[PDB]
From Swiss-Prot, chains A, B:
PROSITE patterns: BETA_LACTAMASE_D. Induction: Expressed from an upstream promoter, P(out), in an insertion sequence IS1999. This is Beta-lactamase OXA-48. It catalyses: a beta-lactam + H2O = a substituted beta-amino acid. Class D beta-lactamase which confers resistance to the beta-lactam antibiotics, including amoxicillin, and moderate resistance to cephalosporins and carbapenems such as cephalothin and imipenem; in the DH10B strain of E.coli. Acts via hydrolysis of the beta-lactam ring. Has oxacillin-, cephalothin- and imipenem-hydrolyzing activities. Belongs to the class-D beta-lactamase family. Monomer. Dimer. The gene is OXA-48. A beta-lactam binds at S47, K50, S95, R227. Inhibited by avibactam, related diazabicyclooctane (DBO) derivatives and by bicyclic boronic acids, via a covalent binding to Ser-47. Inhibited by chloride, bromide and iodide ions. Not inhibited by the beta-lactamase-blocking agents, clavulanic acid or tazobactam. GO terms for biological process: antibiotic catabolic process; cell wall organization; response to antibiotic.
Length: 242, 242
């Protein structure tokens, strides 16, 4: 099932960094990582929780569809892209926490807990504020647990409507060309030490899917682009993307 | 509602070419084109017909979902990418005509006509061979009629399940980055002598979507890249993409 490829650690060291990348070959049903311990270490999901959060909001009509416009609340926050109107597509792309905080408050702590248990999502614990638990409450999920959750989403096997799963998979769209499609979601955990940067999703090829879950130590916000860069270098080495 | 802009013809003449580009601003309900007459002249859809053909095949259950595998028949054809197994995603991406000819035979004359009428697609005429009418039969569609059709698809308004429409829009994914998403379909009309290349679809942006339909005279296969290139030079002049 799982296989440790120590050679990917060079992509972390050359960038003054430390972390884990986890890949899963869907056709062959084989997994790969540079660090199996860290691959199974559970962290706060941070904004990667926007994937299950959207699925719950959509199956509950808190979000009607991907074009509904939730406008700014007039409060200027420290990330410029947040201070405007958004839909599901753009709130996911720019990781607009206030929008999903409003979703969370509308979902409710009860329905949130039941749905995460149904998703088998991490430790299934929402202790804390209903609108911040994924950022500074009790929820914990590991890299291999992200892949397990993403594989069910890819196959429409989560305990929500197929429509909700298709919409969220649409909103996860990050990059596409004639070689590959990436559906993914970034995340940055800052409230609990050590600070952690996430990238989780998958790569669609013509005749295979490669799921990935990555996290790395991220002391400041200036190295956040290293999440995609390191992940891509592993993908280039494994001949997954050209 | 419609405005002419002959500045765009410079992009055509720059490449010793001729054709039409039609843009539709969804927010403004406003349209633009370099040649109004040509914008409303009907042509064979060629492989742009794979958009409606896919919708009908999915709705009628000829295609179960975007993962079902259509086996190569073993007949070696001139386009190398056709000589392999395909699913709906890859059959669209590589314009695999033989796969869609099998769809059309399964759908059949009676159901194909009824669905095209319900779609109000072009002249709604499928006279000719059931498995080749979009390539050398009687169906005809204009650039502006393509947009009218695409707008209905985008809003899930066609007489097919929302699921059918969602799957075809996923299969139309062509290009995506941080700036825009392009969902489109190429086409190459070669059997009636006004031999033309098509590119129809739309560009998704954060706060808007720009529908487009273009066709140009295309004497050989070597100029096919000019469909996307000229279209993009127009989108970059209107500052629709960076
Ligand atoms: C409004 C409620 O706020 C909180 C409530 C409760 C706890 C924490 C927050 N804050 C803390 C600050 N934060 C933050 N910091 C740095 N970069 C980013 N970014 C967004 C996520 C991006 C990503 O996904 O990579 C990276 C940049 N976010 C957002 C969450
Ligand atoms: C199998 C049945 O065929 C026929 C039956 C009946 C009439 C015509 C065809 N033929 C003609 C040859 N053809 C063709 N030629 C050149 N390039 C391409 N291409 C595919 C479309 C691509 C595009 O979508 O842009 C461009 C390349 N296709 C496919 C359709
Ligand atoms: Cl396949
Ligand atoms: Cl998509």
């Amino acid at each position: 099932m799982w296989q440790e490829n120590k050679s990917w650690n060079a992509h972390f060291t050359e960038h003054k960094s430390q972390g884990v990348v986890v890949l899963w070959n869907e056709n062959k049903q084989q997994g790969f990582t540079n660090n199996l311990k860290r691959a199974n270490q559970a962290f706060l999901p941070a904004s990667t929780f926007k994937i299950p959060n959207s699925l719950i909001a959509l199956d509950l009509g808190v979000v009607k569809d991907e074009h509904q416009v939730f406008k700014w609340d007039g409060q200027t926050r420290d990330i410029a892209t947040w201070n405007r109107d958004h839909n599901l597509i753009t709130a996911m792309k720019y990781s607009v926490v206030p929008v999903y905080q409003e979703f969370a408050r509308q979902i409710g702590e009860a329905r949130m807990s039941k749905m995460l248990h149904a998703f088998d999502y991490g430790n299934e614990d929402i202790s804390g504020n209903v609108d911040s638990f994924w950022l500074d409450g009790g929820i914990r999920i590991s890299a291999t647990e992200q892949i397990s959750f993403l594989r069910k989403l890819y196959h429409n096997k989560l305990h929500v409507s197929e429509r909700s799963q298709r919409i969220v998979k649409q909103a996860m769209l990050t990059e596409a060309n004639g070689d590959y499609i990436i559906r993914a979601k970034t995340g940055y955990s800052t409230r609990i030490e050590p600070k952690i940067g996430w990238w989780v999703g998958w790569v669609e090829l013509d005749d295979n899917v490669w799921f990935f879950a990555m996290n790395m130590d991220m002391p400041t916000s200036d190295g956040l682009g290293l999440r995609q860069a390191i992940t891509k270098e592993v993908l280039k080495q494994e001949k997954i993307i050209p």
